[PDB]
Amino acid sequence: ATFEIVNRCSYTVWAAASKGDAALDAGGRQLNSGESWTINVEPGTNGGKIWARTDCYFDDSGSGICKTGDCGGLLRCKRFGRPPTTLAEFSLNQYGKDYIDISNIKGFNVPMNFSPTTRGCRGVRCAADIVGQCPAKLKAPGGGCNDACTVFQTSEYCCTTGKCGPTEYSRFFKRLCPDAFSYVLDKPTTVTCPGSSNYRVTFCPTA
């Protein structure tokens, strides 16, 4: 599968692609305002994620720190990023179909549009100003809007017992971004795409 990661934000972001235990393609790259980064994800990839990182500082060896989405301090991400991260989640070639979605379960840092570049399905988008409207107890000092589970670490916010309902914090992400997961047991906004589809991830799609 081909993913075109486009940065339409006015600021530089550091794109990141990982499946949890391994990097997707290079795993991470700097994206200036307007730059595009095309990566190749192996078919059958399960649990792949793409997100943006803000205010990063790496050395010549690719080791550093980001204010949002830091993946163990590496420019090329092998693990998932540190919240708050707007997540482009996808599972490819699952019994003949691809499944994509946008998730606010791990917070919000950059607006994002997750659309296919091939026919067969629609795209998802979470481009509201969640950071500007973020509740006080969820505002991340380093930028972005944390999720309730990251802030308070309770069973109800993290849905650890598998029995959880929507909260006042999750209803905030759902109100500004109804097409994205607000919590774990939220009504699925997953889009079913044809198998072996190609996609484009656009940071700040309305910029």
Side-chain angles (χ1 to χ4, degrees), residues 102-113:
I102 293 179
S103 175
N104 287 317
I105 298 173
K106 291 295 176 182
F108 181 94
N109 67 333
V110 176
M112 155 192 298
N113 178 92

Side-chain angles (χ1 to χ4, degrees), residues 174-204:
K174 202 62 179 178
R175 179 173 56 84
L176 301 199
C177 281
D179 292 274
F181 280 85
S182 55
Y183 64 109
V184 179
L185 290 194
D186 191 15
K187 191 206 295 183
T189 48
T190 303
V191 176
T192 299
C193 287
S196 303
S197 294
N198 302 324
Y199 307 92
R200 175 186 290 105
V201 177
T202 304
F203 299 133
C204 301

Side-chain angles (χ1 to χ4, degrees), residues 4-5 8 11 13 23-25 42 47 50 57 61 67 77 90-91 97 106-107 156 172 174 181 196 198-200 205:
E4 185 182 36
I5 307 181
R8 198 171 291 162
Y11 48 88
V13 306
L24 296 184
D25 192 284
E42 176 179 53
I50 288 177
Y57 301 89
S61 60
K67 287 198 175 182
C77 291
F90 52 91
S91 289
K97 292 295 182 180
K106 291 295 176 182
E156 189 64 25
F172 160 73
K174 202 62 179 178
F181 280 85
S196 303
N198 302 324
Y199 307 92
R200 175 186 290 105

Side-chain angles (χ1 to χ4, degrees), residues 9-189:
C9 307
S10 58
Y11 48 88
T12 297
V13 306
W14 285 258
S18 175
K19 60 179 295 181
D21 48 23
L24 296 184
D25 192 284
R29 210 205 82 179
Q30 171 172 336
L31 278 182
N32 290 323
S33 182
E35 287 186 341
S36 298
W37 183 34
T38 300
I39 67 177
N40 289 272
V41 178
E42 176 179 53
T45 295
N46 189 276
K49 298 188 193 303
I50 288 177
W51 68 101
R53 299 170 290 173
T54 65
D55 295 286
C56 298
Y57 301 89
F58 299 104
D59 57 16
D60 54 321
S61 60
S63 297
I65 179 66
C66 300
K67 287 198 175 182
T68 64
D70 189 76
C71 58
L74 301 181
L75 171 62
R76 297 174 174 83
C77 291
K78 305 178 304 180
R79 267 62 183 176
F80 288 145
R82 181 185 190 268
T85 63
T86 316
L87 291 179
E89 305 175 343
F90 52 91
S91 289
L92 310 180
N93 307 97
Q94 301 303 321
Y95 299 98
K97 292 295 182 180
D98 298 343
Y99 297 93
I100 65 174
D101 68 86
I102 293 179
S103 175
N104 287 317
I105 298 173
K106 291 295 176 182
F108 181 94
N109 67 333
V110 176
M112 155 192 298
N113 178 92
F114 195 4
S115 294
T117 60
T118 56
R119 66 185 183 275
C121 56
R122 72 174 183 91
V124 281
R125 174 176 294 187
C126 175
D129 185 19
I130 289 181
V131 182
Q133 304 291 350
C134 187
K137 295 179 182 176
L138 298 182
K139 292 169 66 65
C145 193
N146 280 123
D147 61 279
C149 170
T150 296
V151 176
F152 300 101
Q153 291 287 275
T154 68
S155 299
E156 189 64 25
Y157 293 149
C158 304
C159 294
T160 316
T161 58
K163 297 181 178 180
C164 62
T167 67
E168 186 167 333
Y169 292 130
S170 68
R171 288 186 188 92
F172 160 73
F173 295 91
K174 202 62 179 178
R175 179 173 56 84
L176 301 199
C177 281
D179 292 274
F181 280 85
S182 55
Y183 64 109
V184 179
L185 290 194
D186 191 15
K187 191 206 295 183
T189 48

